[PDB]
Amino acid sequence: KQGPTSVAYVEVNNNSMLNVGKYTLADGGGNAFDVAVIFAANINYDTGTKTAYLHFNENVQRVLDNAVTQIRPLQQQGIKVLLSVLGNHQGAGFANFPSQQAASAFAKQLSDAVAKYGLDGVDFDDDYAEYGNNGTAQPNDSSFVHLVTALRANMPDKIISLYNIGPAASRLSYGGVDVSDKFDYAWNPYYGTWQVPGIALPKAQLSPAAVEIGRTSRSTVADLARRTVDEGYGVYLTYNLDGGDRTADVSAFTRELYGSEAVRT
């Protein structure tokens, strides 16, 4: 196969991670999706100890517990599985850790979870942190740099991506350390639009295109996939892959990115 890296987010509250592996190319049998993102674990905040901590809801916990049936088969077929981490309305976000020491401890929780569940990496979606809640601080400009540096050092051979949104997303430099190059990819969160991420990564690692499989018109899925290839960008983002038969929607972009329609098992 040859073309941009395709990513699929799955809201595990309602959908199965396995749907991502159901799609292959008619010509070649290659994967229609290269990366699968578990959406999403959380950054919670313990008001008592004034410490943020990683949290998994019932659904997230459940698929993680069942890695052998939910994640593992996706990986055997060559799809990389990432755990997305999102804000949870508790004031703590990726941009307000009080110190390097504090961000590092959270980064360790991340790498420990990735190691413990055999994941390929982590995705950051600094949304819903609702900074300030529970007496927390607003975003500062070293928190994220400290979090990313520590994580990258914890799992140097794995994936770390950025969902381009929120405070964290524009706090990539501090004290001479720009953490842009510690990200493997970065992509646009706005479905049905082309918005190039600001992060300092080469075209090969960015996805200005964003689509919601099923919602975005197949004509826009296609125009976005086409511009991706035309402009030379190396990543393409699909959000909310569900269990319906989305063969036509996947083919919309696979024909332009890879030159083959998709088949679904």
PDB file of all heavy atoms in Angstrom, residues 9 125-128 162-167 169 187-198 207-213 215-216 220 224 236-239:
ATOM      1  N   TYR A   9     -10.689   7.130  15.187  1.00  0.00           N
ATOM      2  CA  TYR A   9     -10.994   7.249  16.604  1.00  0.00           C
ATOM      3  C   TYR A   9     -12.268   6.455  16.780  1.00  0.00           C
ATOM      4  O   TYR A   9     -13.143   6.498  15.909  1.00  0.00           O
ATOM      5  CB  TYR A   9     -11.324   8.686  16.981  1.00  0.00           C
ATOM      6  CG  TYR A   9     -10.171   9.529  17.423  1.00  0.00           C
ATOM      7  CD1 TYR A   9      -9.099   9.787  16.578  1.00  0.00           C
ATOM      8  CD2 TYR A   9     -10.193  10.145  18.661  1.00  0.00           C
ATOM      9  CE1 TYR A   9      -8.082  10.642  16.959  1.00  0.00           C
ATOM     10  CE2 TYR A   9      -9.178  11.009  19.055  1.00  0.00           C
ATOM     11  CZ  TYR A   9      -8.131  11.252  18.200  1.00  0.00           C
ATOM     12  OH  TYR A   9      -7.133  12.101  18.603  1.00  0.00           O
ATOM     13  N   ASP A 125      -5.903  14.863  23.985  1.00  0.00           N
ATOM     14  CA  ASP A 125      -7.042  15.660  23.566  1.00  0.00           C
ATOM     15  C   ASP A 125      -7.337  16.507  24.804  1.00  0.00           C
ATOM     16  O   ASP A 125      -7.980  16.044  25.759  1.00  0.00           O
ATOM     17  CB  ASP A 125      -8.236  14.753  23.187  1.00  0.00           C
ATOM     18  CG  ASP A 125      -9.487  15.535  22.759  1.00  0.00           C
ATOM     19  OD1 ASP A 125      -9.532  16.770  22.877  1.00  0.00           O
ATOM     20  OD2 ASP A 125     -10.446  14.901  22.297  1.00  0.00           O
ATOM     21  N   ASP A 126      -6.777  17.716  24.817  1.00  0.00           N
ATOM     22  CA  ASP A 126      -6.961  18.628  25.928  1.00  0.00           C
ATOM     23  C   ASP A 126      -8.268  19.345  25.729  1.00  0.00           C
ATOM     24  O   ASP A 126      -8.308  20.490  25.283  1.00  0.00           O
ATOM     25  CB  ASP A 126      -5.824  19.633  26.006  1.00  0.00           C
ATOM     26  CG  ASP A 126      -5.805  20.377  27.308  1.00  0.00           C
ATOM     27  OD1 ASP A 126      -6.135  19.767  28.351  1.00  0.00           O
ATOM     28  OD2 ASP A 126      -5.419  21.559  27.296  1.00  0.00           O
ATOM     29  N   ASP A 127      -9.344  18.627  25.990  1.00  0.00           N
ATOM     30  CA  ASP A 127     -10.674  19.171  25.865  1.00  0.00           C
ATOM     31  C   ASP A 127     -11.406  18.797  27.152  1.00  0.00           C
ATOM     32  O   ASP A 127     -11.116  17.763  27.768  1.00  0.00           O
ATOM     33  CB  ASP A 127     -11.381  18.550  24.656  1.00  0.00           C
ATOM     34  CG  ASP A 127     -12.159  19.571  23.833  1.00  0.00           C
ATOM     35  OD1 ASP A 127     -12.335  20.719  24.289  1.00  0.00           O
ATOM     36  OD2 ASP A 127     -12.600  19.226  22.718  1.00  0.00           O
ATOM     37  N   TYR A 128     -12.300  19.677  27.584  1.00  0.00           N
ATOM     38  CA  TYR A 128     -13.099  19.460  28.775  1.00  0.00           C
ATOM     39  C   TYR A 128     -12.358  19.491  30.106  1.00  0.00           C
ATOM     40  O   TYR A 128     -12.933  19.142  31.124  1.00  0.00           O
ATOM     41  CB  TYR A 128     -13.873  18.145  28.681  1.00  0.00           C
ATOM     42  CG  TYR A 128     -14.594  17.920  27.384  1.00  0.00           C
ATOM     43  CD1 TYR A 128     -14.453  16.709  26.702  1.00  0.00           C
ATOM     44  CD2 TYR A 128     -15.390  18.912  26.822  1.00  0.00           C
ATOM     45  CE1 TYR A 128     -15.079  16.491  25.496  1.00  0.00           C
ATOM     46  CE2 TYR A 128     -16.027  18.706  25.608  1.00  0.00           C
ATOM     47  CZ  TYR A 128     -15.865  17.490  24.948  1.00  0.00           C
ATOM     48  OH  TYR A 128     -16.487  17.268  23.738  1.00  0.00           O
ATOM     49  N   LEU A 162      -1.088  14.259  19.018  1.00  0.00           N
ATOM     50  CA  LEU A 162      -1.755  15.446  19.509  1.00  0.00           C
ATOM     51  C   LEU A 162      -3.062  15.721  18.736  1.00  0.00           C
ATOM     52  O   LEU A 162      -3.057  15.862  17.503  1.00  0.00           O
ATOM     53  CB  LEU A 162      -0.828  16.644  19.289  1.00  0.00           C
ATOM     54  CG  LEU A 162      -1.391  17.986  19.671  1.00  0.00           C
ATOM     55  CD1 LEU A 162      -1.618  18.133  21.177  1.00  0.00           C
ATOM     56  CD2 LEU A 162      -0.483  19.151  19.272  1.00  0.00           C
ATOM     57  N   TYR A 163      -4.113  15.771  19.522  1.00  0.00           N
ATOM     58  CA  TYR A 163      -5.402  16.159  18.979  1.00  0.00           C
ATOM     59  C   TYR A 163      -5.347  17.647  19.103  1.00  0.00           C
ATOM     60  O   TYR A 163      -5.380  18.198  20.215  1.00  0.00           O
ATOM     61  CB  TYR A 163      -6.492  15.444  19.755  1.00  0.00           C
ATOM     62  CG  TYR A 163      -7.932  15.806  19.392  1.00  0.00           C
ATOM     63  CD1 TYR A 163      -8.665  15.030  18.478  1.00  0.00           C
ATOM     64  CD2 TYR A 163      -8.532  16.901  20.014  1.00  0.00           C
ATOM     65  CE1 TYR A 163     -10.012  15.336  18.223  1.00  0.00           C
ATOM     66  CE2 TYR A 163      -9.875  17.194  19.766  1.00  0.00           C
ATOM     67  CZ  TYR A 163     -10.617  16.410  18.889  1.00  0.00           C
ATOM     68  OH  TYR A 163     -11.930  16.691  18.674  1.00  0.00           O
ATOM     69  N   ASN A 164      -5.281  18.313  17.982  1.00  0.00           N
ATOM     70  CA  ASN A 164      -5.036  19.755  17.986  1.00  0.00           C
ATOM     71  C   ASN A 164      -6.174  20.633  18.521  1.00  0.00           C
ATOM     72  O   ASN A 164      -6.907  21.276  17.769  1.00  0.00           O
ATOM     73  CB  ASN A 164      -4.662  20.271  16.603  1.00  0.00           C
ATOM     74  CG  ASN A 164      -4.030  21.676  16.625  1.00  0.00           C
ATOM     75  OD1 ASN A 164      -3.307  22.010  17.562  1.00  0.00           O
ATOM     76  ND2 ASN A 164      -4.266  22.521  15.639  1.00  0.00           N
ATOM     77  N   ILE A 165      -6.257  20.744  19.835  1.00  0.00           N
ATOM     78  CA  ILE A 165      -7.302  21.551  20.430  1.00  0.00           C
ATOM     79  C   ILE A 165      -6.940  21.879  21.862  1.00  0.00           C
ATOM     80  O   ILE A 165      -6.174  21.164  22.495  1.00  0.00           O
ATOM     81  CB  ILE A 165      -8.627  20.779  20.383  1.00  0.00           C
ATOM     82  CG1 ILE A 165      -9.792  21.733  20.156  1.00  0.00           C
ATOM     83  CG2 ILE A 165      -8.813  19.926  21.633  1.00  0.00           C
ATOM     84  CD1 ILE A 165     -11.036  21.035  19.617  1.00  0.00           C
ATOM     85  N   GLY A 166      -7.418  23.018  22.327  1.00  0.00           N
ATOM     86  CA  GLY A 166      -7.183  23.415  23.700  1.00  0.00           C
ATOM     87  C   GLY A 166      -5.855  24.032  24.076  1.00  0.00           C
ATOM     88  O   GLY A 166      -4.902  24.003  23.287  1.00  0.00           O
ATOM     89  N   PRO A 167      -5.766  24.568  25.318  1.00  0.00           N
ATOM     90  CA  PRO A 167      -4.611  25.224  25.935  1.00  0.00           C
ATOM     91  C   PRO A 167      -3.320  24.486  25.669  1.00  0.00           C
ATOM     92  O   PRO A 167      -2.358  25.068  25.176  1.00  0.00           O
ATOM     93  CB  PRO A 167      -4.950  25.179  27.428  1.00  0.00           C
ATOM     94  CG  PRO A 167      -6.422  25.403  27.418  1.00  0.00           C
ATOM     95  CD  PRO A 167      -6.894  24.507  26.277  1.00  0.00           C
ATOM     96  N   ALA A 169      -2.516  22.349  23.414  1.00  0.00           N
ATOM     97  CA  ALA A 169      -2.137  22.380  22.005  1.00  0.00           C
ATOM     98  C   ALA A 169      -1.301  23.579  21.541  1.00  0.00           C
ATOM     99  O   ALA A 169      -0.665  23.496  20.484  1.00  0.00           O
ATOM    100  CB  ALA A 169      -3.357  22.192  21.121  1.00  0.00           C
ATOM    101  N   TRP A 187      -3.180  16.266  14.405  1.00  0.00           N
ATOM    102  CA  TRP A 187      -4.279  16.385  13.473  1.00  0.00           C
ATOM    103  C   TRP A 187      -5.413  17.292  13.908  1.00  0.00           C
ATOM    104  O   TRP A 187      -5.629  17.544  15.096  1.00  0.00           O
ATOM    105  CB  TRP A 187      -4.815  14.993  13.156  1.00  0.00           C
ATOM    106  CG  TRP A 187      -4.920  14.104  14.365  1.00  0.00           C
ATOM    107  CD1 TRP A 187      -5.785  14.249  15.410  1.00  0.00           C
ATOM    108  CD2 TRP A 187      -4.185  12.899  14.616  1.00  0.00           C
ATOM    109  NE1 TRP A 187      -5.645  13.211  16.295  1.00  0.00           N
ATOM    110  CE2 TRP A 187      -4.670  12.359  15.837  1.00  0.00           C
ATOM    111  CE3 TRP A 187      -3.165  12.214  13.943  1.00  0.00           C
ATOM    112  CZ2 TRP A 187      -4.178  11.155  16.390  1.00  0.00           C
ATOM    113  CZ3 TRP A 187      -2.671  11.023  14.487  1.00  0.00           C
ATOM    114  CH2 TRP A 187      -3.180  10.508  15.703  1.00  0.00           C
ATOM    115  N   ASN A 188      -6.127  17.761  12.893  1.00  0.00           N
ATOM    116  CA  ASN A 188      -7.272  18.655  12.978  1.00  0.00           C
ATOM    117  C   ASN A 188      -8.463  17.931  13.623  1.00  0.00           C
ATOM    118  O   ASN A 188      -8.809  16.815  13.240  1.00  0.00           O
ATOM    119  CB  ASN A 188      -7.605  19.112  11.541  1.00  0.00           C
ATOM    120  CG  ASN A 188      -8.860  19.945  11.448  1.00  0.00           C
ATOM    121  OD1 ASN A 188      -9.155  20.751  12.326  1.00  0.00           O
ATOM    122  ND2 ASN A 188      -9.589  19.781  10.352  1.00  0.00           N
ATOM    123  N   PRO A 189      -9.080  18.558  14.638  1.00  0.00           N
ATOM    124  CA  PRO A 189     -10.229  18.004  15.357  1.00  0.00           C
ATOM    125  C   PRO A 189     -11.586  18.361  14.754  1.00  0.00           C
ATOM    126  O   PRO A 189     -12.613  17.804  15.169  1.00  0.00           O
ATOM    127  CB  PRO A 189     -10.078  18.648  16.719  1.00  0.00           C
ATOM    128  CG  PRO A 189      -9.673  20.012  16.346  1.00  0.00           C
ATOM    129  CD  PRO A 189      -8.602  19.778  15.310  1.00  0.00           C
ATOM    130  N   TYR A 190     -11.596  19.308  13.816  1.00  0.00           N
ATOM    131  CA  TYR A 190     -12.828  19.779  13.168  1.00  0.00           C
ATOM    132  C   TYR A 190     -13.210  18.985  11.908  1.00  0.00           C
ATOM    133  O   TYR A 190     -12.656  19.173  10.826  1.00  0.00           O
ATOM    134  CB  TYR A 190     -12.698  21.267  12.853  1.00  0.00           C
ATOM    135  CG  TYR A 190     -12.402  22.063  14.097  1.00  0.00           C
ATOM    136  CD1 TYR A 190     -11.165  22.684  14.290  1.00  0.00           C
ATOM    137  CD2 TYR A 190     -13.334  22.121  15.130  1.00  0.00           C
ATOM    138  CE1 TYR A 190     -10.859  23.343  15.508  1.00  0.00           C
ATOM    139  CE2 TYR A 190     -13.049  22.767  16.338  1.00  0.00           C
ATOM    140  CZ  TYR A 190     -11.809  23.375  16.532  1.00  0.00           C
ATOM    141  OH  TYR A 190     -11.544  23.948  17.766  1.00  0.00           O
ATOM    142  N   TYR A 191     -14.207  18.134  12.083  1.00  0.00           N
ATOM    143  CA  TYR A 191     -14.734  17.265  11.044  1.00  0.00           C
ATOM    144  C   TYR A 191     -15.299  18.055   9.876  1.00  0.00           C
ATOM    145  O   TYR A 191     -16.009  19.048  10.084  1.00  0.00           O
ATOM    146  CB  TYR A 191     -15.814  16.374  11.646  1.00  0.00           C
ATOM    147  CG  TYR A 191     -15.434  15.897  13.022  1.00  0.00           C
ATOM    148  CD1 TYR A 191     -16.382  15.749  14.034  1.00  0.00           C
ATOM    149  CD2 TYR A 191     -14.090  15.711  13.337  1.00  0.00           C
ATOM    150  CE1 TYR A 191     -15.977  15.419  15.353  1.00  0.00           C
ATOM    151  CE2 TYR A 191     -13.680  15.406  14.613  1.00  0.00           C
ATOM    152  CZ  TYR A 191     -14.606  15.261  15.626  1.00  0.00           C
ATOM    153  OH  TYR A 191     -14.107  14.973  16.882  1.00  0.00           O
ATOM    154  N   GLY A 192     -15.001  17.587   8.666  1.00  0.00           N
ATOM    155  CA  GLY A 192     -15.473  18.230   7.453  1.00  0.00           C
ATOM    156  C   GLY A 192     -14.734  19.484   7.039  1.00  0.00           C
ATOM    157  O   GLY A 192     -15.224  20.250   6.214  1.00  0.00           O
ATOM    158  N   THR A 193     -13.569  19.722   7.620  1.00  0.00           N
ATOM    159  CA  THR A 193     -12.809  20.908   7.262  1.00  0.00           C
ATOM    160  C   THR A 193     -11.360  20.555   7.093  1.00  0.00           C
ATOM    161  O   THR A 193     -10.919  19.478   7.511  1.00  0.00           O
ATOM    162  CB  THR A 193     -12.874  22.045   8.364  1.00  0.00           C
ATOM    163  OG1 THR A 193     -12.350  21.572   9.608  1.00  0.00           O
ATOM    164  CG2 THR A 193     -14.284  22.532   8.575  1.00  0.00           C
ATOM    165  N   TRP A 194     -10.634  21.490   6.490  1.00  0.00           N
ATOM    166  CA  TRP A 194      -9.193  21.402   6.298  1.00  0.00           C
ATOM    167  C   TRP A 194      -8.625  22.540   7.139  1.00  0.00           C
ATOM    168  O   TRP A 194      -8.899  23.708   6.862  1.00  0.00           O
ATOM    169  CB  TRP A 194      -8.810  21.635   4.836  1.00  0.00           C
ATOM    170  CG  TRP A 194      -7.294  21.696   4.567  1.00  0.00           C
ATOM    171  CD1 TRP A 194      -6.479  22.803   4.620  1.00  0.00           C
ATOM    172  CD2 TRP A 194      -6.463  20.610   4.155  1.00  0.00           C
ATOM    173  NE1 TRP A 194      -5.199  22.465   4.254  1.00  0.00           N
ATOM    174  CE2 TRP A 194      -5.164  21.128   3.958  1.00  0.00           C
ATOM    175  CE3 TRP A 194      -6.685  19.250   3.921  1.00  0.00           C
ATOM    176  CZ2 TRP A 194      -4.105  20.328   3.549  1.00  0.00           C
ATOM    177  CZ3 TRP A 194      -5.637  18.463   3.517  1.00  0.00           C
ATOM    178  CH2 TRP A 194      -4.362  19.000   3.328  1.00  0.00           C
ATOM    179  N   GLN A 195      -7.933  22.201   8.226  1.00  0.00           N
ATOM    180  CA  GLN A 195      -7.290  23.193   9.096  1.00  0.00           C
ATOM    181  C   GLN A 195      -5.922  22.640   9.496  1.00  0.00           C
ATOM    182  O   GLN A 195      -5.822  21.738  10.318  1.00  0.00           O
ATOM    183  CB  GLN A 195      -8.104  23.463  10.362  1.00  0.00           C
ATOM    184  CG  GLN A 195      -9.478  24.063  10.142  1.00  0.00           C
ATOM    185  CD  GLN A 195     -10.157  24.415  11.445  1.00  0.00           C
ATOM    186  OE1 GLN A 195     -11.384  24.380  11.555  1.00  0.00           O
ATOM    187  NE2 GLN A 195      -9.362  24.752  12.449  1.00  0.00           N
ATOM    188  N   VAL A 196      -4.876  23.158   8.875  1.00  0.00           N
ATOM    189  CA  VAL A 196      -3.522  22.717   9.153  1.00  0.00           C
ATOM    190  C   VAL A 196      -3.121  22.958  10.624  1.00  0.00           C
ATOM    191  O   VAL A 196      -3.317  24.057  11.153  1.00  0.00           O
ATOM    192  CB  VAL A 196      -2.539  23.443   8.206  1.00  0.00           C
ATOM    193  CG1 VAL A 196      -1.077  23.044   8.522  1.00  0.00           C
ATOM    194  CG2 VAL A 196      -2.929  23.163   6.716  1.00  0.00           C
ATOM    195  N   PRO A 197      -2.639  21.905  11.330  1.00  0.00           N
ATOM    196  CA  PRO A 197      -2.246  22.125  12.720  1.00  0.00           C
ATOM    197  C   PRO A 197      -1.056  23.084  12.834  1.00  0.00           C
ATOM    198  O   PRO A 197      -0.181  23.131  11.961  1.00  0.00           O
ATOM    199  CB  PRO A 197      -1.915  20.714  13.198  1.00  0.00           C
ATOM    200  CG  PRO A 197      -2.872  19.886  12.442  1.00  0.00           C
ATOM    201  CD  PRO A 197      -2.745  20.465  11.051  1.00  0.00           C
ATOM    202  N   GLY A 198      -1.039  23.851  13.921  1.00  0.00           N
ATOM    203  CA  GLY A 198       0.023  24.808  14.137  1.00  0.00           C
ATOM    204  C   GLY A 198       1.327  24.176  14.558  1.00  0.00           C
ATOM    205  O   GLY A 198       2.381  24.704  14.251  1.00  0.00           O
ATOM    206  N   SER A 207      -2.205  16.142   9.737  1.00  0.00           N
ATOM    207  CA  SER A 207      -3.462  15.883   9.067  1.00  0.00           C
ATOM    208  C   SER A 207      -4.368  17.100   9.158  1.00  0.00           C
ATOM    209  O   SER A 207      -5.046  17.282  10.156  1.00  0.00           O
ATOM    210  CB  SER A 207      -4.171  14.689   9.693  1.00  0.00           C
ATOM    211  OG  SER A 207      -5.354  14.387   8.980  1.00  0.00           O
ATOM    212  N   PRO A 208      -4.318  18.002   8.161  1.00  0.00           N
ATOM    213  CA  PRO A 208      -5.186  19.186   8.192  1.00  0.00           C
ATOM    214  C   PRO A 208      -6.661  18.782   7.952  1.00  0.00           C
ATOM    215  O   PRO A 208      -7.598  19.525   8.278  1.00  0.00           O
ATOM    216  CB  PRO A 208      -4.646  20.039   7.037  1.00  0.00           C
ATOM    217  CG  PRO A 208      -3.258  19.594   6.884  1.00  0.00           C
ATOM    218  CD  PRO A 208      -3.339  18.112   7.068  1.00  0.00           C
ATOM    219  N   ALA A 209      -6.856  17.596   7.381  1.00  0.00           N
ATOM    220  CA  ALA A 209      -8.176  17.055   7.096  1.00  0.00           C
ATOM    221  C   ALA A 209      -8.733  16.277   8.286  1.00  0.00           C
ATOM    222  O   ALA A 209      -7.988  15.577   8.983  1.00  0.00           O
ATOM    223  CB  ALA A 209      -8.097  16.141   5.892  1.00  0.00           C
ATOM    224  N   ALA A 210     -10.045  16.383   8.483  1.00  0.00           N
ATOM    225  CA  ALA A 210     -10.736  15.696   9.562  1.00  0.00           C
ATOM    226  C   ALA A 210     -12.132  15.370   9.088  1.00  0.00           C
ATOM    227  O   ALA A 210     -12.812  16.223   8.532  1.00  0.00           O
ATOM    228  CB  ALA A 210     -10.812  16.572  10.795  1.00  0.00           C
ATOM    229  N   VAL A 211     -12.557  14.128   9.264  1.00  0.00           N
ATOM    230  CA  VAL A 211     -13.890  13.745   8.842  1.00  0.00           C
ATOM    231  C   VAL A 211     -14.539  12.896   9.909  1.00  0.00           C
ATOM    232  O   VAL A 211     -13.860  12.343  10.775  1.00  0.00           O
ATOM    233  CB  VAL A 211     -13.893  12.915   7.490  1.00  0.00           C
ATOM    234  CG1 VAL A 211     -13.279  13.719   6.365  1.00  0.00           C
ATOM    235  CG2 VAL A 211     -13.178  11.559   7.645  1.00  0.00           C
ATOM    236  N   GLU A 212     -15.863  12.880   9.899  1.00  0.00           N
ATOM    237  CA  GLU A 212     -16.601  12.018  10.798  1.00  0.00           C
ATOM    238  C   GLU A 212     -17.308  11.011   9.892  1.00  0.00           C
ATOM    239  O   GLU A 212     -18.217  11.367   9.151  1.00  0.00           O
ATOM    240  CB  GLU A 212     -17.618  12.776  11.635  1.00  0.00           C
ATOM    241  CG  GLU A 212     -18.184  11.861  12.684  1.00  0.00           C
ATOM    242  CD  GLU A 212     -19.339  12.439  13.463  1.00  0.00           C
ATOM    243  OE1 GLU A 212     -19.659  13.635  13.284  1.00  0.00           O
ATOM    244  OE2 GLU A 212     -19.920  11.682  14.275  1.00  0.00           O
ATOM    245  N   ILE A 213     -16.821   9.776   9.905  1.00  0.00           N
ATOM    246  CA  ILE A 213     -17.359   8.702   9.076  1.00  0.00           C
ATOM    247  C   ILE A 213     -18.848   8.586   9.365  1.00  0.00           C
ATOM    248  O   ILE A 213     -19.261   8.484  10.513  1.00  0.00           O
ATOM    249  CB  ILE A 213     -16.607   7.345   9.345  1.00  0.00           C
ATOM    250  CG1 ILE A 213     -16.217   6.673   8.024  1.00  0.00           C
ATOM    251  CG2 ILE A 213     -17.458   6.383  10.193  1.00  0.00           C
ATOM    252  CD1 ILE A 213     -15.037   7.295   7.313  1.00  0.00           C
ATOM    253  N   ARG A 215     -21.180  10.976   9.139  1.00  0.00           N
ATOM    254  CA  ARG A 215     -21.802  12.294   9.179  1.00  0.00           C
ATOM    255  C   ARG A 215     -21.366  13.181   8.015  1.00  0.00           C
ATOM    256  O   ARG A 215     -22.208  13.773   7.340  1.00  0.00           O
ATOM    257  CB  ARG A 215     -21.501  13.009  10.499  1.00  0.00           C
ATOM    258  CG  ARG A 215     -22.149  14.386  10.599  1.00  0.00           C
ATOM    259  CD  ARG A 215     -21.357  15.335  11.475  1.00  0.00           C
ATOM    260  NE  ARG A 215     -22.253  16.274  12.142  1.00  0.00           N
ATOM    261  CZ  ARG A 215     -22.326  16.449  13.462  1.00  0.00           C
ATOM    262  NH1 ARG A 215     -21.532  15.777  14.291  1.00  0.00           N
ATOM    263  NH2 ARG A 215     -23.190  17.323  13.960  1.00  0.00           N
ATOM    264  N   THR A 216     -20.055  13.300   7.814  1.00  0.00           N
ATOM    265  CA  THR A 216     -19.513  14.124   6.738  1.00  0.00           C
ATOM    266  C   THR A 216     -19.952  13.525   5.407  1.00  0.00           C
ATOM    267  O   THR A 216     -19.935  12.299   5.252  1.00  0.00           O
ATOM    268  CB  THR A 216     -17.965  14.177   6.780  1.00  0.00           C
ATOM    269  OG1 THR A 216     -17.521  14.643   8.061  1.00  0.00           O
ATOM    270  CG2 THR A 216     -17.448  15.129   5.728  1.00  0.00           C
ATOM    271  N   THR A 220     -17.243  15.407   0.548  1.00  0.00           N
ATOM    272  CA  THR A 220     -16.256  16.159   1.323  1.00  0.00           C
ATOM    273  C   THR A 220     -15.178  15.211   1.866  1.00  0.00           C
ATOM    274  O   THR A 220     -14.032  15.599   1.994  1.00  0.00           O
ATOM    275  CB  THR A 220     -16.900  16.967   2.469  1.00  0.00           C
ATOM    276  OG1 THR A 220     -17.902  17.848   1.938  1.00  0.00           O
ATOM    277  CG2 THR A 220     -15.846  17.808   3.181  1.00  0.00           C
ATOM    278  N   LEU A 224     -11.434  16.071   0.721  1.00  0.00           N
ATOM    279  CA  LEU A 224     -10.453  16.229   1.792  1.00  0.00           C
ATOM    280  C   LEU A 224      -9.334  15.244   1.607  1.00  0.00           C
ATOM    281  O   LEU A 224      -8.173  15.575   1.811  1.00  0.00           O
ATOM    282  CB  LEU A 224     -11.096  16.048   3.173  1.00  0.00           C
ATOM    283  CG  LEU A 224     -11.933  17.239   3.659  1.00  0.00           C
ATOM    284  CD1 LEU A 224     -12.741  16.899   4.901  1.00  0.00           C
ATOM    285  CD2 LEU A 224     -11.024  18.427   3.886  1.00  0.00           C
ATOM    286  N   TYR A 236      -4.336  11.234   7.621  1.00  0.00           N
ATOM    287  CA  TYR A 236      -5.736  11.506   7.325  1.00  0.00           C
ATOM    288  C   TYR A 236      -6.555  11.015   8.529  1.00  0.00           C
ATOM    289  O   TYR A 236      -6.388   9.875   8.966  1.00  0.00           O
ATOM    290  CB  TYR A 236      -6.153  10.792   6.044  1.00  0.00           C
ATOM    291  CG  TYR A 236      -7.542  11.148   5.554  1.00  0.00           C
ATOM    292  CD1 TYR A 236      -7.767  12.288   4.782  1.00  0.00           C
ATOM    293  CD2 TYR A 236      -8.635  10.330   5.845  1.00  0.00           C
ATOM    294  CE1 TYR A 236      -9.064  12.598   4.302  1.00  0.00           C
ATOM    295  CE2 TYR A 236      -9.924  10.636   5.365  1.00  0.00           C
ATOM    296  CZ  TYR A 236     -10.126  11.764   4.598  1.00  0.00           C
ATOM    297  OH  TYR A 236     -11.388  12.021   4.102  1.00  0.00           O
ATOM    298  N   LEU A 237      -7.407  11.894   9.069  1.00  0.00           N
ATOM    299  CA  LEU A 237      -8.229  11.602  10.252  1.00  0.00           C
ATOM    300  C   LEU A 237      -9.694  11.294  10.078  1.00  0.00           C
ATOM    301  O   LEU A 237     -10.426  12.066   9.474  1.00  0.00           O
ATOM    302  CB  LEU A 237      -8.108  12.733  11.278  1.00  0.00           C
ATOM    303  CG  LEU A 237      -7.175  12.386  12.435  1.00  0.00           C
ATOM    304  CD1 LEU A 237      -7.842  11.395  13.396  1.00  0.00           C
ATOM    305  CD2 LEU A 237      -5.883  11.797  11.854  1.00  0.00           C
ATOM    306  N   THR A 238     -10.108  10.166  10.640  1.00  0.00           N
ATOM    307  CA  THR A 238     -11.497   9.732  10.618  1.00  0.00           C
ATOM    308  C   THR A 238     -11.939   9.681  12.065  1.00  0.00           C
ATOM    309  O   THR A 238     -11.226   9.193  12.943  1.00  0.00           O
ATOM    310  CB  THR A 238     -11.675   8.318  10.003  1.00  0.00           C
ATOM    311  OG1 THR A 238     -11.665   8.420   8.573  1.00  0.00           O
ATOM    312  CG2 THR A 238     -13.004   7.680  10.447  1.00  0.00           C
ATOM    313  N   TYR A 239     -13.108  10.215  12.328  1.00  0.00           N
ATOM    314  CA  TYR A 239     -13.587  10.191  13.671  1.00  0.00           C
ATOM    315  C   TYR A 239     -14.882   9.457  13.740  1.00  0.00           C
ATOM    316  O   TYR A 239     -15.656   9.446  12.790  1.00  0.00           O
ATOM    317  CB  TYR A 239     -13.783  11.606  14.194  1.00  0.00           C
ATOM    318  CG  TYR A 239     -12.499  12.360  14.406  1.00  0.00           C
ATOM    319  CD1 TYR A 239     -11.985  13.204  13.415  1.00  0.00           C
ATOM    320  CD2 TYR A 239     -11.809  12.261  15.615  1.00  0.00           C
ATOM    321  CE1 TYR A 239     -10.811  13.944  13.636  1.00  0.00           C
ATOM    322  CE2 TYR A 239     -10.643  12.986  15.842  1.00  0.00           C
ATOM    323  CZ  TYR A 239     -10.149  13.825  14.855  1.00  0.00           C
ATOM    324  OH  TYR A 239      -9.007  14.560  15.103  1.00  0.00           O
TER     325      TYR A 239
END
